[PDB]
């Protein structure tokens, strides 16, 4: 992504000067209208160097977890993961999701069992209310684990939107050593992101830019 | 509080009776008396064959008894000799032409009667009970049981005050009638007193009614 | 009017006004009436003595009033004289026919006493 490509999308946007985090000073161009302005001169090379690492991980058969819980951007992140056949979390993050990998496996198994049961049959054996209830639980589990039913082993890389909002995820990742790739607004604490992208995390246009560029490079890394 | 007998409540839904003959009120009582005494005789005589259930079904002129044991070769002895002997015996008790057809249980660790009597046989041999019950539950679920709960009550370890000790593992949903929950009770007579064991073994929901 | 026995019957349906006498009740009364031929719904007033004397004649056949009172008193006195169980319970003033006496035997013991 080129600085002009970002700027038109508005990547330079940042949270009000009232709300910023101390470590973000190096990445901040300045202020206008009491608004923090992010410096694309740092943003572009860091994003490119992160894309290099993401291409490397995906080119060694990496499993990628796209992470974002914004109600506006949930579908964008889900489609972004689907466009590169990668796993995703688009709904509210569950506490200790990576730390309780054993607990999630049972939920995935239950989600797989419910979908398998509906295809196999025995819904007729169940009472009509019971069969409907099983379908509702399967739908709830799909809303809960649609993205990670095919996760298999813990992921090899994480992409995070608004790292401050998803702080539990990054704490887990660091506890596991799983690398964190994150779009970091001025209000976020950048310590948890090993490849940090400072940029707007709310605006739909810039978020879609991030996701599309990442997914293009991930498909490229897969293609070899 | 008290709990309904799990086997006695699932007779209509998932559990078959153990005496399936028919008779009108004229000779209902004495049928019951005869089959009670014959099954008690068989229990007393097969205290080592490890029998789990003795089902009894009567043709109009005959009595048919099916034994469920874990040691078929034992009860049939040599060339079916002793089984024919006890067939003559049940012929005496019932006063009726008798037929005995033994049946085996493939997973003896999955029979509430069997595991309960084994627990009691261990207790009367003066072994620490916690070991007994936890070994039983471990074996059961190692043999692929959906759940099992063991319960012992009495003067455990010769206690002056009787305590209740249970141990559950897996799923044991007593309230769900659809569940195949096999249950049986055994007693062990030690010098201190009589100790009672109860075993629930849940082997999976049976979708699709009785049949 | 006047009927055999000291008591005077009141003016109402004969079958009922006849019950006034100590020895006659509802079935014996209608028996007396049918024997005398007088209907039941007739009153004792508006009833000529020509049938009143017949009524007293037919009631004379049965034991009634004072003679019955003396006869029952002799029977209880005889019972007491035998010394039989019933005689004892009669002179004791207690239920005679085997009723429960642990409680609620008041009809023969009178009101509760301290």
């Amino acid at each position: 992504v080129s600085m002009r490509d970002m700027l038109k999308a508005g990547v330079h946007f940042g949270h009000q000067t009232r709300y910023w985090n101390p470590k973000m000073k190096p990445f901040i161009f300045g202020a206008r209208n009491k608004v923090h302005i992010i410096n694309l001169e740092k943003t572009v090379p860091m994003f490119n160097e992160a894309l290099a690492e993401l291409n490397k991980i995906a080119s060694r058969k990496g499993k990628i977890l796209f992470v974002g819980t914004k109600r506006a951007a949930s579908e964008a992140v889900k489609d972004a993961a689907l466009s590169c056949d990668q796993f995703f979390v688009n709904h509210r993050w569950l506490g200790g999701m990576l730390t309780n990998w054993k607990t999630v496996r049972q939920s995935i198994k239950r989600l797989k069992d419910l979908e398998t049961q509906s295809q196999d049959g025995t819904f007729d054996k169940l009472t009509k209310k019971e069969a409907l209830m099983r379908t509702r639980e399967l739908e709830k589990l799909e809303n809960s684990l649609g993205g990670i039913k095919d996760m298999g082993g813990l992921p090899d890389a994480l992409f995070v939107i608004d790292a401050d909002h998803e702080h539990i995820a990054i704490k887990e990742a660091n506890n596991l050593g799983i690398p964190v790739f994150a779009i970091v607004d001025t209000n976020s604490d950048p310590d948890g992101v090993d490849f940090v992208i400072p940029g707007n995390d709310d605006a739909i246009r810039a978020v879609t830019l991030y996701l599309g560029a990442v997914a293009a490079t991930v498909r490229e890394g897969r293609s070899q | 509080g008290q709990k309904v007998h799990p086997n006695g409540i699932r007779l209509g839904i998932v559990k078959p009776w153990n005496s399936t003959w028919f008779a009108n009120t004229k000779e209902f009582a004495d049928n019951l008396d005869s089959d009670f005494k014959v099954r008690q005789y068989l229990t007393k005589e097969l205290a080592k064959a490890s029998v789990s259930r003795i089902v009894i079904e009567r043709p109009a002129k005959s009595i048919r008894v099916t034994i469920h044991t874990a040691r078929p070769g034992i009860v049939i002895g040599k060339k079916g000799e002793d089984v024919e002997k006890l067939r003559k015996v049940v012929a005496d008790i019932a006063g009726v032409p008798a037929q005995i057809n033994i049946a085996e249980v493939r997973k003896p660790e999955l029979d509430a009667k069997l595991v309960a009597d084994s627990i009691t046989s261990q207790l009367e041999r003066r072994v620490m009970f916690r070991r007994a019950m936890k070994r039983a539950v471990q074996n059961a679920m190692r043999l692929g049981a959906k759940g099992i709960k063991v319960e012992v009550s009495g003067r455990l370890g010769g206690a002056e005050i009787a305590r209740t000790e249970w141990y559950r593992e897996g799923r044991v949903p007593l309230h769900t009638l659809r569940a195949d929950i096999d249950y049986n009770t055994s007693e062990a007579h030690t010098t201190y007193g009589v100790i009672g064991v109860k075993v629930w073994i849940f082997k999976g929901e049976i979708l699709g009614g009785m049949a | 009017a006047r009927i055999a026995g000291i008591n005077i019957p009141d003016h109402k349906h004969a079958v009922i006004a006849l019950t006034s006498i100590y020895g006659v009740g509802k079935t014996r009364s209608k028996a007396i009436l049918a024997a005398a031929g007088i209907a039941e719904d007739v009153k004792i007033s508006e009833l000529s003595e020509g049938q009143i004397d017949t009524l007293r004649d037919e009631v004379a056949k049965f034991v009634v009033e004072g003679d019955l009172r003396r006869e029952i008193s002799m029977s209880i006195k005889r019972l007491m004289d035998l010394g039989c169980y019933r005689g004892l319970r009669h002179r004791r003033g207690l239920p005679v026919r085997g009723q429960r006496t642990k409680t609620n035997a008041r009809t023969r013991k009178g009101p509760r006493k301290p």
Partner: protein, 100 residues
């Protein structure tokens, strides 16, 4: 109960069945209309000579497993207790918990 009671019951029934025919014929002669009151008299005297434990009205249905003299159920021949064990264990055919 006490073995004495069960023995008493078995003796009572084993005498009632024995003297059944004689008792029946004698009661017939007694209650029979047109019977000569001397024959009726001899019959009512003879009746009380038989063992008093021959009258069937003198027996008591006891639990056929414990001898309990209460809570009896003619259909099964057991007290109100043992019927519950036999039922819950699946020994009384076609017997199950009712609900309506």
């Amino acid at each position: 109960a006490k073995q004495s009671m069960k023995a008493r019951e078995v003796k009572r029934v084993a005498l009632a069945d024995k003297y059944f025919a004689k008792r029946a014929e004698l009661k017939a002669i007694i209650s029979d209309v047109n019977a000569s009151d001397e024959d009726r008299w001899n019959a009512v005297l003879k009746l009380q000579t038989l063992p008093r434990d021959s009258s069937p009205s003198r027996q008591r249905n006891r639990c056929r497993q414990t001898g309990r003299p209460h809570g009896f159920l003619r259909k099964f021949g057991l007290s109100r207790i043992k019927v519950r064990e036999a039922a819950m264990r699946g020994e009384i055919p076609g017997l199950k918990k009712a609900s309506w």
